[PDB]
Swiss-Prot record:
Localization per Swiss-Prot or TrEMBL: Host endoplasmic reticulum membrane
Residue numbers binding Zn(2+) 6: C191, C194, C226, C228
Start-end of each LRR repeat: 119-141
Effect upon mutating Y270 to G/T: Reduced inhibition by GRL-0617
Effect of T77L: Increased cleavage of ubiquitin in vitro; no effect on ISG15 cleavage in vitro
Active site: C113, H274, D288
Catalytic activity line of the entry: Thiol-dependent hydrolysis of ester, thioester, amide, peptide and isopeptide bonds formed by the C-terminal Gly of ubiquitin (a 76-residue protein attached to proteins as an intracellular targeting signal)
Residue ranges constituting the Peptidase C16 domain according to the UniProt record: 73-318
Name of the protein: Papain-like protease nsp3
Chain positions of all zinc fingers (C4-type): 191-228
Positions in coiled-coil regions: none
């Protein structure tokens, strides 16, 4: 038998389409919308105040219209997506993002070194994301608002804050949401008696290789067993992509200046390690979270190396 007091607020799932709602000041936001967020903070267990008049609240996609709007923006209708994204955003907005040598890094916290390495890599390769939420956060990440982008990365990769991570695993997850269908790779394997056989790779597989860190060795030739037994030679004949990513288990490797875009250093064992990002500019730079180190040459345990590419064709011919 208690009076009703009302204020008008806005609900959204993408912060682009706002939906006017009139709420009762006697019930909580959870009792009317479900899980509700106001500027990242969970406001489910509280009641509307006059200070909420006209503000915009995040909600989970329960309505038919909200599912469509969430699908066009995030490319997913998973109900636990926003939940995991808001939980991650609660940590990433508390992180420090120093501007290390014109790039945006992350101060070490909650084992975020693999995210920092990946975020630095994403700022040095040409890449377009299909989900609008990622592409919007990608540009603001290059500007400086990387807290929102790191939360999306964690949410898309299904990785909770504080857990150890893999840079290559993180990159390949994001590559699925990238427009890489125009990338093309032509490989050629030659055997001494079986003969020669060429295959073509498109999409994500055209920009990743697991076997050697050296882009040059991939062009000169890598030894690969044949179905007949003896050792064959595989070479990269044609490559069309904005970049290539060469990966291998962490081994001591020398990075010569000007021969790559950036690389991933991994120190430690398979159970627990430490990620550092090496980048090549006027000289060799080493970004370790908030720390920076120069040197003319570099020698350390590398696991991923990124190269710039546009169009490469050998003239040898098959
Ligand atoms: Zn053979």
């Amino acid at each position: 038998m208690r009076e009703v007091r009302t204020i008008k607020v806005f609900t959204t799932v993408d912060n682009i389409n706002l939906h006017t709602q009139v709420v009762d000041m006697s019930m909580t936001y959870g009792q009317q919308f479900g899980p509700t967020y106001l500027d990242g903070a969970d406001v489910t267990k509280i009641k509307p105040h006059n200070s909420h008049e006209g503000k915009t609240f995040y909600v989970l996609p329960n309505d038919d219209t909200l599912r469509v709007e969430a699908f066009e923006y995030y490319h997913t209708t998973d109900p636990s997506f926003l939940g995991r994204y808001m939980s991650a955003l609660n940590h990433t907005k508390k992180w420090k993002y120093p501007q290390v040598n014109g790039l945006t890094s992350i101060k070490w916290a909650d084992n975020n070194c693999y995210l920092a390495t990946a975020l630095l890599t994403l700022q040095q390769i040409e890449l377009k994301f299909n989900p609008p939420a990622l592409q919007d956060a990608y540009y603001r990440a290059r500007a400086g608002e990387a807290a929102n982008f790191c939360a999306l990365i964690l949410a898309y990769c299904n990785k909770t804050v504080g857990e150890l991570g893999d840079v290559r695993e993180t990159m390949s997850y994001l590559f699925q949401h990238a427009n890489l269908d125009s990338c093309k790779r032509v490989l050629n394997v030659v055997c001494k008696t079986c003969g020669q056989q060429q295959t073509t790779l498109k999409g994500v597989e055209a920009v990743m290789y697991m076997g050697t860190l050296s882009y040059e060795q991939f062009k000169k030739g890598v030894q690969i067993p044949c179905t007949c037994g003896k050792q064959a030679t595989k070479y990269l004949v044609q490559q069309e992509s904005p970049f290539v990513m060469m990966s291998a288990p962490p081994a001591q490797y020398e990075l010569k200046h000007g021969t790559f875009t950036c690389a991933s250093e991994y120190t430690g064992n398979y159970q627990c390690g430490h990620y550092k990002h090496i980048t090549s500019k006027e000289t060799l730079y080493c970004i370790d979270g908030a720390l920076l180190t120069k040197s003319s040459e570099y020698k350390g345990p590398i696991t991923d190396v990124f190269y710039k590419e546009n169009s490469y064709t050998t003239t040898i011919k098959p």
